[PDB]
Design an enzyme around this catalytic site. Structure first.
Site, PDB file in Angstrom:
ATOM      1  N   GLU A   1       0.823  -1.205   0.000  1.00  0.00           N
ATOM      2  CA  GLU A   1       0.000   0.000   0.000  1.00  0.00           C
ATOM      3  C   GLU A   1       0.864   1.265   0.000  1.00  0.00           C
ATOM      4  OE1 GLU A   1      -2.594   1.373  -0.807  1.00  0.00           O
ATOM      5  OE2 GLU A   1      -4.012   1.778   0.810  1.00  0.00           O
ATOM      6  N   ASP A   2       0.301   2.370  -0.480  1.00  0.00           N
ATOM      7  CA  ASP A   2       1.028   3.633  -0.557  1.00  0.00           C
ATOM      8  C   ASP A   2       1.105   4.361   0.789  1.00  0.00           C
ATOM      9  OD1 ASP A   2      -1.691   4.097  -0.541  1.00  0.00           O
ATOM     10  OD2 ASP A   2      -1.597   5.830  -1.885  1.00  0.00           O
TER      11      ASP A   2
ATOM     12  N   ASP B   1      -3.431   6.187   7.000  1.00  0.00           N
ATOM     13  CA  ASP B   1      -3.817   7.321   7.828  1.00  0.00           C
ATOM     14  C   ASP B   1      -4.722   6.852   8.965  1.00  0.00           C
ATOM     15  OD1 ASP B   1      -4.264   9.827   8.865  1.00  0.00           O
ATOM     16  OD2 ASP B   1      -4.868  10.739   6.963  1.00  0.00           O
TER      17      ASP B   1
ATOM     18  N   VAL C   1       0.771  14.799   1.405  1.00  0.00           N
ATOM     19  CA  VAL C   1       1.901  14.691   0.493  1.00  0.00           C
ATOM     20  C   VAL C   1       1.486  14.084  -0.846  1.00  0.00           C
ATOM     21  CG1 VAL C   1       3.468  14.432   2.442  1.00  0.00           C
ATOM     22  CG2 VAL C   1       2.596  12.400   1.272  1.00  0.00           C
TER      23      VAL C   1
ATOM     24  N   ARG D   1       0.643  12.144  -9.645  1.00  0.00           N
ATOM     25  CA  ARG D   1       1.066  10.747  -9.655  1.00  0.00           C
ATOM     26  C   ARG D   1       2.333  10.581 -10.483  1.00  0.00           C
ATOM     27  NH1 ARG D   1      -2.717   7.485  -6.998  1.00  0.00           N
ATOM     28  NH2 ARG D   1      -4.920   8.005  -7.370  1.00  0.00           N
TER      29      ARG D   1
HETATM   30  O1  LIG Z   1      -0.943  12.198   2.291  1.00  0.00           O
HETATM   31  C1  LIG Z   1      -1.913  11.671   1.389  1.00  0.00           C
HETATM   32  N1  LIG Z   1      -1.763  11.847   0.079  1.00  0.00           N
HETATM   33  C2  LIG Z   1      -2.673  11.352  -0.764  1.00  0.00           C
HETATM   34  N2  LIG Z   1      -3.739  10.683  -0.368  1.00  0.00           N
HETATM   35  C3  LIG Z   1      -3.968  10.459   0.950  1.00  0.00           C
HETATM   36  C4  LIG Z   1      -3.049  10.952   1.889  1.00  0.00           C
HETATM   37  N3  LIG Z   1      -3.513  10.591   3.119  1.00  0.00           N
HETATM   38  C5  LIG Z   1      -4.664   9.907   2.955  1.00  0.00           C
HETATM   39  N4  LIG Z   1      -4.955   9.812   1.667  1.00  0.00           N
HETATM   40  C6  LIG Z   1      -6.131   9.148   1.102  1.00  0.00           C
HETATM   41  C7  LIG Z   1      -5.878   7.670   0.798  1.00  0.00           C
HETATM   42  C8  LIG Z   1      -4.905   7.548  -0.369  1.00  0.00           C
HETATM   43  O2  LIG Z   1      -5.330   6.455  -1.191  1.00  0.00           O
HETATM   44  O3  LIG Z   1      -5.375   7.026   1.926  1.00  0.00           O
HETATM   45  C9  LIG Z   1      -6.359   6.697   2.885  1.00  0.00           C
HETATM   46  C10 LIG Z   1      -5.712   5.836   3.987  1.00  0.00           C
HETATM   47  P1  LIG Z   1      -6.819   5.610   5.445  1.00  0.00           P
HETATM   48  O4  LIG Z   1      -8.103   4.933   5.009  1.00  0.00           O
HETATM   49  O5  LIG Z   1      -7.142   6.949   6.047  1.00  0.00           O
HETATM   50  O6  LIG Z   1      -6.123   4.746   6.473  1.00  0.00           O
HETATM   51 MG   LIG Z   2      -3.907   3.180  -0.844  1.00  0.00          MG
END
Ligand SMILES: O=c1[nH]cnc2c1ncn2C[C@@H](CO)OCCP(=O)(O)O
Ligand SMILES: [Mg+2]
Ligand SMILES: O=c1[nH]cnc2c1ncn2C[C@@H](CO)OCCP(=O)(O)O
Ligand SMILES: O=c1[nH]cnc2c1ncn2C[C@@H](CO)OCCP(=O)(O)O
Ligand SMILES: O=c1[nH]cnc2c1ncn2C[C@@H](CO)OCCP(=O)(O)O
Ligand SMILES: [Mg+2]
Ligand SMILES: [Mg+2]
Ligand SMILES: [Mg+2]
Lengths: 194, 195, 194, 197
Positions: free
Chosen positions: C112-113, C116, C164, C176
């Site tokens: 995963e990227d 949060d 970020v 991206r």
């Molecule tokens: O810093 C960020 N950059 C870009 N997107 C972000 C970021 N944080 C959150 N997202 C949304 C999403 C990305 O796919 O992540 C959600 C994770 P979660 O469900 O909260 O545990």
């Molecule tokens: Mg993700």
């Protein structure tokens, strides 16, 4: 292993199929050995070096100027092997052109090309005077030529027909070092830099 | 693209950093990983020359095309951050069958291989329904086969013989995707991993 | 390992010091995590992964879209370690976005990227573990700094509570096509706002 | 610009967070500048160099030994630029330890050094090179130390401005050791005595 055997009738590649610098656009004829293929073979040569010499401290000796690229990239793959394995050995480096630190060491000579073999056997005879534990020679290119005195290196990248090639730090009167591929010069190029 | 003739011997597996157990299976390495990259770098310059004038939507055709997609886009990005001419890119991933974020956009479809060619024609017809500015296709491989419908992609890496290849995310029955080089699978290999 | 800890006082790097695409020149404010640092960290992750999961058939699950480049780079390092161990284990890949019956009885690595709230990962874990693999491990490039209570098995960087972009991570599907992890400017936020 | 400024307060990175050669596991203490960060900065330097020296034939001069990594990587990025454009310039290379230097005459000379401390090594070299009347001469140095013992010279191209500490790795050595290290790191006390001359 005699290395990647490149046939006598190997045509090479059309320049338009690859990225080449514009200032050499008419000085080259064909891409003979693509830079990526060199990397692939070099990664494998690094593993071979590590299997024959990795049991003791290695001094990598670069033969400037032609060998410096192969030297740098070979050492990179060796260092990559050494920070991902628990089998590893320290390396110091030195440079020479055509020194008591080689005594008792595993000396690896990194060369760009072997033709008549005269350069290396001169180099080897000089090195052996200082009594290393072993001397191995890695040569990116070895030519098939009747002018050969009969010397063969321990590690070979590519075995090629007797044809003049440039690129990957190999020069034509100091030119074509700034070229990632190994290539053959056009009739225009030879004249331009002769 | 780079034409690999029918009589191409390829390379011995021993010549590259490849596990030796892939010997009974497979046959020879036909396209070394580094040869792919060099060609791919060029294709990035070609793509950016023809499609650089408008926002590009890069369309990755999973699963076989994800490595070529990843590498081609790195080279495009390298171009975009080291020259005067650059364009924004967005990415998307799709997979096809069995048996609108493209409207007014420059769509680049990234495929692993084109055999008969009607997979792309079907895909190309579904797109252009939603009226993009242009659709172009970049395929790593194109086979010379008498089963071809006659379609030819706008960007070709290598034109290969009519032999089944694997590696670089390309598969035979979901096998051999993690191989870093493009190689021909042997007849024994085919029967071995046949579903 | 909590990964590479990135404190909230870290200013990052000036954009003029690195190579940035010209179409994001005033859309970005600061480089947060350079691409090469991501590679260096990822290289280490791969060995940590193989030290834990490398004892069995590995299935790497890529979470699209944001994780595809982290997935590809992580996999290349893992594939490299795999063929270097002289004991190559079966490694197959798959993709999911927010029939995976090929996860049964194998070592599943979720890639995963960013994490949060952890709701994304909790959701994905309940679906996967409803297939009974040997083990489930989660490799996340970024983890933000008391939500729910989840901790990835492998972490690249622990980052502040800040939005970020880059390295396939997006802002409204944009940024991206950026190799660095960077911080978005006010002009950039309003430009690509939905 | 002084390049990527690295504060004196920098704790560096723990060795367990990165991939380091095991024969240096106890000889290092902290990773100072990750190899990948060096590359990214070098890519930028390459375009900065090319944007300023690309107008005429370039002679890249590598200061052995520690300059070898920076030199190879910098020229790699330079080559990528020269083959991705419509305009490029021919380049020749040479290696010095501190060719007939008349080959520098009328050329755009790029001196590639690993690290600058007092600055005397580069000042003296500059004065010598300028005598051969090159078209221009610029200096690229990966590291530049913030030191009280500086004569006051500052390079034309700088990767990182590091504090007055002793670092090794990425071709920079300690008694010929640590050149086989990709990261720039701080040598431990254990390793300081292990390879002490
Ligand atoms: O810093 C960020 N950059 C870009 N997107 C972000 C970021 N944080 C959150 N997202 C949304 C999403 C990305 O796919 O992540 C959600 C994770 P979660 O469900 O909260 O545990
Ligand atoms: Mg993700
Ligand atoms: O194909 C070539 N390209 C560029 N130079 C070449 C080539 N062949 C020869 N040289 C000259 C020289 C390079 O330093 O090689 C000497 C090797 P030897 O002593 O005969 O075994
Ligand atoms: O040589 C191969 N290797 C791996 N897969 C292959 C191969 N040939 C075919 N496929 C299946 C598929 C790959 O996406 O190609 C179908 C495209 P088409 O409709 O025939 O133009
Ligand atoms: O931090 C270091 N690591 C390894 N070697 C180093 C270091 N500093 C200095 N050197 C030696 C030498 C570099 O070539 O310094 C001469 C430059 P100066 O004339 O003092 O400005
Ligand atoms: Mg030589
Ligand atoms: Mg396909
Ligand atoms: Mg120096």
């Amino acid at each position: 292993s005699p290395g990647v055997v490149i046939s006598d009738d190997e045509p090479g590649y059309d320049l338009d199929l690859f990225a080449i610098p514009n200032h050499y656009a008419e000085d080259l004829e064909r891409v003979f050995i693509p830079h990526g293929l060199i990397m692939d073979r070099t990664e494998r040569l690094a593993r071979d070096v590590m299997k024959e010499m990795g049991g003791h401290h290695i001094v990598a000796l670069c033969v400037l100027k032609g060998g410096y690229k192969f030297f740098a990239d070979l050492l990179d793959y060796i260092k990559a092997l050494n920070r991902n394995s628990d089998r590893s050995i320290p390396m110091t480096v030195d440079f020479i052109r055509l020194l008591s630190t080689l005594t008792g060491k595993n000396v690896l000579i990194v060369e760009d090309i072997i033709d008549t073999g005269k350069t290396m056997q001169t180099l080897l005879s000089l090195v052996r005077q200082y009594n290393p534990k072993m001397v191995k020679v890695a040569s990116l290119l070895v030519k098939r030529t009747p002018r050969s005195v009969g010397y063969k290196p321990d590690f070979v990248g590519f075995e090629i027909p007797d044809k003049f090639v440039v690129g990957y730090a190999l020069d034509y009167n100091e030119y074509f070092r700034d070229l990632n591929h190994v290539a053959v010069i056009s009739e225009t190029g030879k004249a331009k830099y002769k």
